[PDB]
Amino acid sequence: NQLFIIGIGTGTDEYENFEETILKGVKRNELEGQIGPDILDNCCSDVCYFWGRSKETIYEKKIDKGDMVLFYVGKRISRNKVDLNQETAVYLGIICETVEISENDVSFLNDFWRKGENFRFLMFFKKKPEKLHHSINEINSKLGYNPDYFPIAGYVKPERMSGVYDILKNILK
DNA sequence: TACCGG
DNA sequence: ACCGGT
Known part of the structure; x- marks a missing residue:
């Protein structure tokens, strides 16, 4: 029952990859024989929604099923600050399963990701991560x-x- | 800055 | 240990 944040800066290749696999999503036929049939059955419909990173952990915390990811989206200004003058967005996903791809198997990740082979620690989201109506400052403030x-x-x-307990509660039903 | 270290 | 910097 952990919570992570992943910053997606607009106008960058991470945003492009975020478009393809979290916003748009990937038909499960284009993943057959790269991701287990069981992950596909239980985490995906005809479409899989997923993200990936180059390490298995975030601040030494590993990501497992049940956890939550807030994707912050906006124009980045410094290493960890966003421009509050342009549009921002927050999406919330619930981790279904995590899968590691072997380094001699990361070929297929480039099919839909720019430099995708670098991000072989995938995370699958039970349903398409939900666009909140809160801005990044409104969520930041709730979290202190x-x-x-x-x-x-x-x-x-x-x-x-x-x-942010109110929000997650309201999301379940 | 696909974030860690201190 | 988490933030919060350049």
């Missing part, structure tokens, strides 16, 4: 972060989690 906190990949100290 600076308005423009925009981590590239952050772990949210559990004691902050209760500030």
